[PDB]
Write a protein that holds these residues in place. Structure first.
Motif, PDB file in Angstrom:
ATOM      1  N   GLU A 254       0.839  -1.195   0.000  1.00  0.00           N
ATOM      2  CA  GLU A 254       0.000   0.000   0.000  1.00  0.00           C
ATOM      3  C   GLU A 254       0.880   1.253   0.000  1.00  0.00           C
ATOM      4  O   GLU A 254       2.092   1.162   0.192  1.00  0.00           O
ATOM      5  CB  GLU A 254      -0.922   0.009   1.223  1.00  0.00           C
TER       6      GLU A 254
ATOM      7  N   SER B  98      -2.696   4.897   9.693  1.00  0.00           N
ATOM      8  CA  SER B  98      -2.819   3.623   8.997  1.00  0.00           C
ATOM      9  C   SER B  98      -2.945   2.468   9.981  1.00  0.00           C
ATOM     10  O   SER B  98      -2.353   2.485  11.063  1.00  0.00           O
ATOM     11  CB  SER B  98      -1.616   3.387   8.088  1.00  0.00           C
TER      12      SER B  98
ATOM     13  N   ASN C 208      -4.740   2.202   4.783  1.00  0.00           N
ATOM     14  CA  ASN C 208      -4.506   3.634   4.948  1.00  0.00           C
ATOM     15  C   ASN C 208      -5.805   4.359   5.293  1.00  0.00           C
ATOM     16  O   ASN C 208      -6.893   3.902   4.931  1.00  0.00           O
ATOM     17  CB  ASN C 208      -3.869   4.233   3.692  1.00  0.00           C
ATOM     18  N   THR C 209      -5.686   5.470   6.015  1.00  0.00           N
ATOM     19  CA  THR C 209      -6.824   6.348   6.295  1.00  0.00           C
ATOM     20  C   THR C 209      -7.606   6.685   5.011  1.00  0.00           C
ATOM     21  O   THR C 209      -7.011   6.935   3.955  1.00  0.00           O
ATOM     22  CB  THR C 209      -6.352   7.633   7.020  1.00  0.00           C
ATOM     23  N   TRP C 210      -8.937   6.649   5.102  1.00  0.00           N
ATOM     24  CA  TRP C 210      -9.796   6.965   3.961  1.00  0.00           C
ATOM     25  C   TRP C 210     -10.515   8.311   4.121  1.00  0.00           C
ATOM     26  O   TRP C 210     -11.071   8.854   3.155  1.00  0.00           O
ATOM     27  CB  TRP C 210     -10.796   5.834   3.684  1.00  0.00           C
TER      28      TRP C 210
ATOM     29  N   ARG D 198      -8.887  10.703   6.470  1.00  0.00           N
ATOM     30  CA  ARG D 198      -7.805  11.577   6.938  1.00  0.00           C
ATOM     31  C   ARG D 198      -8.168  12.330   8.217  1.00  0.00           C
ATOM     32  O   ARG D 198      -7.826  13.503   8.387  1.00  0.00           O
ATOM     33  CB  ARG D 198      -7.376  12.550   5.827  1.00  0.00           C
TER      34      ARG D 198
ATOM     35  N   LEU E  83      -8.148   7.775  11.812  1.00  0.00           N
ATOM     36  CA  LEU E  83      -8.578   6.396  11.584  1.00  0.00           C
ATOM     37  C   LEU E  83      -8.492   5.665  12.924  1.00  0.00           C
ATOM     38  O   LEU E  83      -7.467   5.733  13.607  1.00  0.00           O
ATOM     39  CB  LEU E  83      -7.694   5.724  10.524  1.00  0.00           C
TER      40      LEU E  83
ATOM     41  N   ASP F 128     -13.497   6.617  10.516  1.00  0.00           N
ATOM     42  CA  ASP F 128     -12.522   7.621  10.115  1.00  0.00           C
ATOM     43  C   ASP F 128     -13.332   8.864   9.757  1.00  0.00           C
ATOM     44  O   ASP F 128     -14.316   8.772   9.013  1.00  0.00           O
ATOM     45  CB  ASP F 128     -11.697   7.119   8.922  1.00  0.00           C
TER      46      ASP F 128
ATOM     47  N   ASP G 127     -17.093   8.476   8.398  1.00  0.00           N
ATOM     48  CA  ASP G 127     -17.048   7.335   7.481  1.00  0.00           C
ATOM     49  C   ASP G 127     -16.714   6.037   8.216  1.00  0.00           C
ATOM     50  O   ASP G 127     -15.543   5.715   8.444  1.00  0.00           O
ATOM     51  CB  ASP G 127     -16.047   7.578   6.342  1.00  0.00           C
TER      52      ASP G 127
ATOM     53  N   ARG H 298     -16.674   1.929   8.494  1.00  0.00           N
ATOM     54  CA  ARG H 298     -16.564   0.761   7.626  1.00  0.00           C
ATOM     55  C   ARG H 298     -16.542  -0.513   8.459  1.00  0.00           C
ATOM     56  O   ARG H 298     -16.026  -0.523   9.583  1.00  0.00           O
ATOM     57  CB  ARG H 298     -15.286   0.823   6.784  1.00  0.00           C
TER      58      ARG H 298
ATOM     59  N   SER I 256     -19.314  -0.020   3.617  1.00  0.00           N
ATOM     60  CA  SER I 256     -19.692   1.190   4.329  1.00  0.00           C
ATOM     61  C   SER I 256     -20.819   0.879   5.302  1.00  0.00           C
ATOM     62  O   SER I 256     -21.624  -0.025   5.061  1.00  0.00           O
ATOM     63  CB  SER I 256     -20.120   2.285   3.354  1.00  0.00           C
TER      64      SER I 256
END
Ligand SMILES: *[C@@H]1O[C@H](CO)[C@@H](O[C@@H]2O[C@H](CO)[C@@H](O[C@@H]3O[C@H](CO[C@H]4O[C@H](CO[C@H]5O[C@H](CO)[C@@H](O)[C@H](O)[C@@H]5O)[C@@H](O)[C@H](O[C@H]5O[C@H](CO)[C@@H](O)[C@H](O)[C@@H]5O)[C@@H]4O)[C@@H](O)[C@H](O[C@H]4O[C@H](CO)[C@@H](O)[C@H](O)[C@@H]4O[C@H]4O[C@H](CO)[C@@H](O)[C@H](O)[C@@H]4O[C@H]4O[C@H](CO)[C@@H](O)[C@H](O)[C@@H]4O)[C@@H]3O)[C@H](O)[C@H]2NC(C)=O)[C@H](O)[C@H]1NC(C)=O
Ligand SMILES: *[C@@H]1O[C@H](CO)[C@@H](O[C@@H]2O[C@H](CO)[C@@H](O[C@@H]3O[C@H](CO[C@H]4O[C@H](CO[C@H]5O[C@H](CO)[C@@H](O)[C@H](O)[C@@H]5O)[C@@H](O)[C@H](O[C@H]5O[C@H](CO)[C@@H](O)[C@H](O)[C@@H]5O)[C@@H]4O)[C@@H](O)[C@H](O[C@H]4O[C@H](CO)[C@@H](O)[C@H](O)[C@@H]4O[C@H]4O[C@H](CO)[C@@H](O)[C@H](O)[C@@H]4O[C@H]4O[C@H](CO)[C@@H](O)[C@H](O)[C@@H]4O)[C@@H]3O)[C@H](O)[C@H]2NC(C)=O)[C@H](O)[C@H]1NC(C)=O
Ligand SMILES: *[C@@H]1O[C@H](CO)[C@@H](O[C@@H]2O[C@H](CO)[C@@H](O[C@@H]3O[C@H](CO[C@H]4O[C@H](CO[C@H]5O[C@H](CO)[C@@H](O)[C@H](O)[C@@H]5O)[C@@H](O)[C@H](O[C@H]5O[C@H](CO)[C@@H](O)[C@H](O)[C@@H]5O)[C@@H]4O)[C@@H](O)[C@H](O[C@H]4O[C@H](CO)[C@@H](O)[C@H](O)[C@@H]4O[C@H]4O[C@H](CO)[C@@H](O)[C@H](O)[C@@H]4O[C@H]4O[C@H](CO)[C@@H](O)[C@H](O)[C@@H]4O)[C@@H]3O)[C@H](O)[C@H]2NC(C)=O)[C@H](O)[C@H]1NC(C)=O
Ligand SMILES: *[C@@H]1O[C@H](CO)[C@@H](O[C@@H]2O[C@H](CO)[C@@H](O[C@@H]3O[C@H](CO[C@H]4O[C@H](CO[C@H]5O[C@H](CO)[C@@H](O)[C@H](O)[C@@H]5O)[C@@H](O)[C@H](O[C@H]5O[C@H](CO)[C@@H](O)[C@H](O)[C@@H]5O)[C@@H]4O)[C@@H](O)[C@H](O[C@H]4O[C@H](CO)[C@@H](O)[C@H](O)[C@@H]4O[C@H]4O[C@H](CO)[C@@H](O)[C@H](O)[C@@H]4O[C@H]4O[C@H](CO)[C@@H](O)[C@H](O)[C@@H]4O)[C@@H]3O)[C@H](O)[C@H]2NC(C)=O)[C@H](O)[C@H]1NC(C)=O
Ligand SMILES: *[C@@H]1O[C@H](CO)[C@@H](O)[C@H](O)[C@H]1NC(C)=O
Ligand SMILES: *[C@@H]1O[C@H](CO)[C@@H](O)[C@H](O)[C@H]1NC(C)=O
Ligand SMILES: *[C@@H]1O[C@H](CO)[C@@H](O)[C@H](O)[C@H]1NC(C)=O
Ligand SMILES: *[C@@H]1O[C@H](CO)[C@@H](O)[C@H](O)[C@H]1NC(C)=O
Ligand SMILES: *[C@@H]1O[C@H](CO)[C@@H](O)[C@H](O)[C@H]1NC(C)=O
Ligand SMILES: [Ca+2]
Ligand SMILES: [Ca+2]
Ligand SMILES: [Ca+2]
Ligand SMILES: [Ca+2]
Lengths: 388, 388, 388, 388
Positions: C371, D122, D136-138, D140, D143, D163, D171, D173, D187
């Motif tokens: 990643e 992350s 990784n953060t989605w 920002r 997370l 996150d 957001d 998940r 989601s």
């Protein structure tokens, strides 16, 4: 792995040899050693370990202040390697509570801890490190148990509990556990009038428990348990060699079926090995306080109300503090007989040594020898002045 | 698992390489490190460990005050991982006492600890972490043993004991154990006139023990043991390279069958590897005190009363304190030969360094190399001033 | 168990994720944490561990005074559980010495420690926790080795040694060990003019070592080893992205077969992963001192003397002290590729922070991710003022 | 070894018994106990352990100053033996980061730690103690994940992540892992309007997660996960017995599909067991702060917006500080049902106790009993004044 069966008799006891000693208070003057009390020893098939009730603090820790206290939410049954001291980093928590027993059945270990307030206490039974069964107080007055190891036969591990008064008639029960499950329980029967803190051991004749009558008797009550039939009887040690503390002087006639009078509402946890001519009794040297400890060979002490000592061994000098004492054996040792063992709790601090604000202990432990070995004395060994 | 058999000869010793060092006193200036003395090293088939007699206190602990004392109820044989220091949290108690030996037979470990007062001491023999046999004092004058590892062959592990005077004729016995049980014992025979603290090793020729004559001799007594026949002989190292401490200067003719005179009623535990042209002897550098340590290659030292060194290696500088030294080998290593090893006890504190009130030690250990390796010196490394 | 074979290529490196960090100096402000330096990481098939050279003292211990010193008799290679700090009670001693390497071959671990004075040093090779072979100094000027893990293929574990000057031509050798035994050694060949402290990793193409030219070059020498043929070649990283410290600014033409000039007689241990377009180089951020650390993606850095970065990741900020850095991989992980990893030594204390009298470090470690992960920076995190 | 399957229903909950308590703050007054927060409990098939996020310092250590801070580079998920405190020497690092979850699938344990700055965080997914996947953060914006154990079924271990904002729409998940690999993510769907810090448990009906709406709702959002289909739904606990903190007083009509209003932008991690008539909810006693803890039996709390308590149990008195609480079960215990368990975090120090400069906690844990056991209360037990 199979359940252990009690198939052997006791080895002939001609003397006692040193088995274990942790020097916990000496070492804890300058180490992270947990404050404990009510210790014992118990064996697994591959290891023997020291057990005790922690106070949830080290000795040098400021929270050691006030550890004379018996029942707080910060106590737990811990176990640790033989003759090491109970440290923060080497002690394994068996369960949470302020009264306990523990024993291995040959397959896995059962541990029982009681916790709660005086009027709402409960026992949790752990088997193979998981909680299995729970028992609520039946008398609402400090549900409590042995403070030394239980004993198993073919998976069945009897345990003695008391709930109710310490200074009058109480409700004593004998529970029969298997893999932590309750098979059966029964009310105390026989002639013992008060039961506390039973010290037990097993041999082919069954399971023998030597306990404490806190109410009226300075002789010790005995409970004999059949672990197959799951029944029991009770009486006192007939011998005039009295073994509770405090206690009157030894008379020439003991009492088999009632308390020997003289000291009321007090006592100490203790033990004996009752085995015909191979009988040995433990007691404090002092009749007034928990100081000193000696073993006395008293033939047929259990049944003979005239019986006196014919041999003995000093374990701790009268000048040195002792405390609780109890029985255990390595049921998984080699040979044709079970070697009798015991521990003595060496209490340091309060109430006898009140210059410090804590109460703790170390452990000394002995096992029997068929030799006639020279004797030593085994003090805790710490100097109180160092903690000042 | 099978009992180990002594089937190999010694590897050729051309130099010594560093094997282990714990730096215990340096680390114990600021860590819970137990006060010890009389250390050694001994191997299991899967692990080698450091051994020593604890004093039941840490160095910084106030109970370290007075640890020059040899025999208290607070001592125990402990073992711990190679080159780690003996800490409260990593030390395993083998048994309780103030004199010891220990060895693995290939299946399990035997440990022996002696305890008691001077006139009533007793040895307890542990096998596979359980007490098996007991031996009472036979001379009532500090029953005592090797303070380094024993050696086994096909299950039979001989051990040397002394009971009686340290400054006159004493009663030395050789015991032959198997699985902790006494197979046989015999009184000391041969020409050695006094025996203390034997350091032993095994090879195909049998078991060789280099000991200490505390009474009259600055040469070292040797006991050679046949572990199959369970018999032994004794004499002295014939060589004029004298290896006790304190000791006279090296003459040109040694003594094979009597003590070399000059220093009475003193000595130090030491060792040698006696192997024809592959013979190496250890000794303190100083003739007056336990300081320095060196190895000397002395061909046929055992039998040749004229033999002198042809090669050597300094282990500890004369400016640095040493102490007891003894032999051990990894009997379970790969290869066609047994690699000779030894440890040196680096004593710190009293009586030589009396600004502190304690007495302890660290360990340095070496094994032989078939290379001719450069040499270093290995001090304890602690600064006494830091403990003030 | 089988010997591990290098059968995989490197995973694609698109970023670096946190792998391990011990926070040793923070924790050692108030814990028995050993003073160390020259750390690394190395994996067994069932466990990965932190490694370092102890100084035989804790940080708070008074013996930490003077630990800027490189080579004393109180140093040892220790290992301890991943991300825990090196404590007195959790650290396992692999061997004694002041320079080291270690690697597992899939069956057992080889560890090598060098000790001795500058002119008489010797290496001892341990295999499966036993000493197996020994190597004497050949140049009599600080015999020394990698200070990070070696790598094995089918039982053969190559190791780079240097003996001789640090500021001129020295005698570098590549040794090939199997089960601790010397199969072969060879003198350094190729175009690298000076070799120190190689950081190595293995993949199907062979074993790659990125080292340090302390004499003249601020570019890094590379040694590529064939572990089957047991031969090697050497050159420099051609790239003008220079990776030693201290170092000149990055020019536009690097040097493949000679040192890039500008800084003489200094340098730091470092590493790289040289893998065509998957090439990443590590370096300190500062060109003057051991501060900061960054990874730079430099395609074909090994062979292209014009190559520049196309991607990067900051590991430690320039405001924060770094130190040695080296490579390791978990050769026993699941999947079709080897995941590149590295550690950075975060040096605290002297000479840069001389308000304290000690020198130690903590560890941070990262592994590659396919990643493109967000980046952080990873300081040691201790406040020097607390130790005052 | 096989993957564990959720094949049992919950045991009938008639009361709660003590399971574990570490007394960490009491013991850490005088021991090397790590500063932690956000603890939980999670079981392997052979062992149950305490988990928490360390702050990379002990309590007495000067670096404990400022540990109210949530996200530093010095945090790590550690685990340690049940009811022992988290010490430097007994704590095992699972991974590095400042938000975590962990669970065993019956074969091996998955651990996930998130690290990084707020805008570039992350997650690294560890399986069987090796890093396997990274996320990784989605959004920002920190997370972050559960802070208690996840649950597995046939190898599939769902985990909830958020996150984005803590005070608005974020957001969320749901990830579905197997052996650390990402099978699928989706989601958040359903009627829950904000999700933080889910506490989950599994039984034959699927996986149930009780979370925290930090934005607007003092009722708790629930996520119900099908681990076979790998799908989920969400809503709130309908009951007017509100269980977040701070919170309004209990009304008589709750809300099933929207936040119950009154307190915005705050909340605490908590849990529930939602099981028809066997439903129990946990909450702080206070409606204003993290003090006290009680369990309430509220039949059909999940679906009935009028439901009220019919039975209860006090766990921690309102006079005593509590904190986070979450669910776990020993999925590998004997019997026909899963025994509901939970832990309560007992936060000591800042911001409520600002005379000290640190923030830490101890743990108390309970499991359900089919008996109706007497209740006690379980305080942390440390006296702040001792740390002054
Ligand atoms: C090296 O180590 C070895 C091994 O340890 C040491 O040897 C040991 O030495 C100790 C100390 O003497 C012994 O302990 C005592 O044992 C005696 C019992 O043995 C004696 O009595 C035996 C029974 O005699 C009776 O029956 C026989 C026939 O069966 C008959 O012949 C005789 O006339 C009498 O009717 C004898 O058989 C025995 O002789 C044998 O052994 C001898 C060696 O001991 C040997 O020499 C002989 O040849 C023969 O082989 C011997 O005479 C215990 O009685 C005694 O315990 C009492 O005394 C201690 C104080 O020392 C006290 O603490 C105990 O509590 C107890 O005394 C109290 O209780 C009594 C009973 O109620 C009461 O009557 C007393 O008045 C007293 O009560 C008061 O105090 C208590 C406690 O505070 C209180 O509760 C009361 O209220 C009241 O205030 C000791 O246990 C070991 O047996 C012995 N072991 C061996 C193997 O020899 C050796 O000393 C060491 N060497 C060195 C140099 O130090
Ligand atoms: C890098 O590392 C390497 C490896 O360690 C270092 O090399 C080592 O260097 C050391 C230091 O010199 C050596 O140790 C000494 O060894 C000698 C023995 O070797 C010498 O003598 C041999 C025997 O000679 C005799 O026989 C031969 C024939 O067999 C005959 O030819 C000869 O004339 C004589 O008759 C020689 O063979 C040998 O030569 C060989 O080796 C040489 C290198 O050493 C080499 O150059 C040659 O080419 C050849 O190959 C050599 O000459 C030991 O004697 C000596 O031990 C004595 O001295 C030390 C002090 O250093 C002392 O502590 C010892 O206790 C002992 O001295 C006492 O005891 C004696 C015996 O009773 C007595 O006679 C003395 O008077 C003295 O007694 C006094 O003190 C003691 C103790 O306090 C007290 O008890 C008494 O009462 C009294 O007060 C050393 O052990 C290593 O052998 C050597 N190793 C190797 C592999 O080379 C190298 O130095 C390092 N490099 C650097 C740069 O540092
Ligand atoms: C969240 O996290 C993520 C992930 O970490 C963060 O994203 C990362 O951000 C960092 C910081 O910028 C990046 O690191 C830098 O990478 C660049 C390389 O990438 C740039 O250049 C590439 C190559 O361009 C060249 O070729 C292409 C064609 O191939 C051509 O088109 C172009 O014109 C040129 O010819 C570009 O491809 C690349 O673009 C791509 O990526 C962009 C994002 O980065 C993206 O926006 C684009 O769309 C495209 O996809 C990009 O432009 C490195 O050059 C740089 O390293 C130098 O600079 C740092 C200082 O930051 C320094 O420390 C390094 O040492 C180095 O600079 C020194 O060395 C040079 C080489 O010798 C020299 O030229 C310099 O002058 C300098 O030398 C001086 O200092 C050194 C050191 O002290 C000394 O030794 C010398 O002597 C001298 O004094 C950085 O590594 C990451 O790559 C990036 N990662 C990702 C995945 O995006 C994100 O920022 C975070 N988010 C937040 C909000 O914080
Ligand atoms: C030894 O140990 C044992 C075992 O622990 C101890 O026994 C326990 O004792 C405790 C303390 O009383 C009990 O906990 C409480 O339980 C009650 C629920 O049980 C009561 O109500 C039941 C339901 O009644 C309703 O329905 C029935 C029909 O279903 C109907 O008949 C009835 O009229 C009514 O409509 C009854 O069924 C039940 O009776 C049964 O049990 C009795 C024993 O409890 C027994 O005597 C009977 O024979 C029968 O078998 C019983 O009456 C909970 O309501 C209560 O929880 C509330 O109160 C506590 C304060 O104590 C508070 O902390 C809780 O949060 C909660 O109160 C708040 O929330 C309410 C709901 O929203 C709200 O209405 C309140 O106004 C209040 O709200 C305020 O505070 C909160 C919190 O700060 C705040 O959020 C709000 O905004 C607001 O400010 C307790 O949980 C145990 O159940 C009981 N266990 C057992 C096995 O008996 C024993 O005491 C110990 N012995 C000794 C000597 O100490
Ligand atoms: C104990 O007895 C039972 C029943 O007779 C038997 O099955 C079991 O194997 C015995 N345990 C041992 C250790 O032999
Ligand atoms: C040692 O010898 C005995 C008897 O000859 C043999 O049975 C045993 O297996 C041998 N031990 C080993 C390790 O081979
Ligand atoms: C050690 O003990 C003696 C008393 O026997 C005392 O005078 C001396 O001061 C003690 N040393 C220390 C360090 O307290
Ligand atoms: C590595 O290769 C050798 C020889 O081809 C083979 O015998 C060995 O099993 C291999 N190792 C593994 C882990 O497969
Ligand atoms: C769980 O279910 C799977 C698939 O049906 C089965 O293969 C596996 O063995 C089960 N796990 C256990 C512990 O029975
Ligand atoms: Ca009484
Ligand atoms: Ca002598
Ligand atoms: Ca350079
Ligand atoms: Ca809320």
């Amino acid at each position: 792995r199979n359940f252990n069966n009690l198939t052997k008799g006791l080895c002939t006891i001609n003397s006692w040899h040193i088995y274990g000693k942790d020097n916990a208070v000496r070492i804890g003057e300058s180490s992270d050693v947990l404050v404990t009390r009510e210790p014992y020893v118990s064996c697994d098939p591959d290891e023997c370990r020291f057990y005790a009730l922690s106070q949830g603090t080290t000795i040098r820790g400021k929270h050691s202040n006030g550890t004379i206290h018996d029942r707080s939410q910060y106590r737990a049954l811990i176990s640790w390697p033989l003759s090491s001291p109970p440290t923060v980093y080497n002690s394994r928590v068996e369960c949470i509570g302020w009264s306990s027993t523990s024993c291995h059945d040959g397959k896995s270990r059962m541990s029982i801890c009681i916790s709660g307030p005086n009027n709402n206490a409960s026992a949790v039974v752990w088997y193979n490190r998981r909680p299995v069964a729970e028992i609520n107080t039946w008398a609402r007055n400090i549900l409590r148990t042995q403070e030394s190891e239980c004993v198993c036969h073919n998976g069945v591990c009897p345990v003695v509990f008391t709930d109710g008064s310490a200074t009058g008639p109480a409700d004593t029960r004998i529970y029969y556990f298997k893999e932590g499950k309750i098979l059966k329980w029964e009310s105390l029967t026989g002639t013992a009038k008060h039961i506390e803190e039973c010290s037990c051991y097993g041999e082919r004749t069954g399971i023998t428990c030597t306990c404490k009558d806190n109410w009226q008797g300075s002789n010790r009550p005995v409970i004999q348990i059949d672990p197959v039939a799951m029944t029991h009887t009770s009486q006192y040690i007939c011998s005039p060699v009295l073994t509770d503390n405090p206690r009157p002087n030894d008379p020439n006639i003991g009492k088999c079926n009632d308390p020997y009078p003289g000291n009321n509402n007090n006592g100490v946890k203790g033990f004996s090995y009752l085995d015909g001519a191979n009988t040995w009794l433990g007691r404090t040297i002092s009749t007034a306080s928990r100081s000193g400890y000696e073993m006395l060979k008293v033939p047929n002490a259990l049944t003979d109300d005239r019986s006196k000592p014919i041999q003995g061994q000093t374990i701790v000098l009268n000048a040195d503090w002792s405390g609780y004492s109890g029985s255990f054996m390595d049921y998984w040792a080699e040979g044709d007989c079970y070697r009798a063992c015991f521990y003595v709790e060496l209490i340091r601090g309060r109430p006898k040594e009140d210059k410090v604000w804590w109460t703790s202990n170390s452990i000394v432990s002995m096992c029997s020898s068929t030799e006639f070995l020279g004797q030593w004395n085994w003090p805790d060994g710490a100097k109180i002045e160092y903690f000042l």
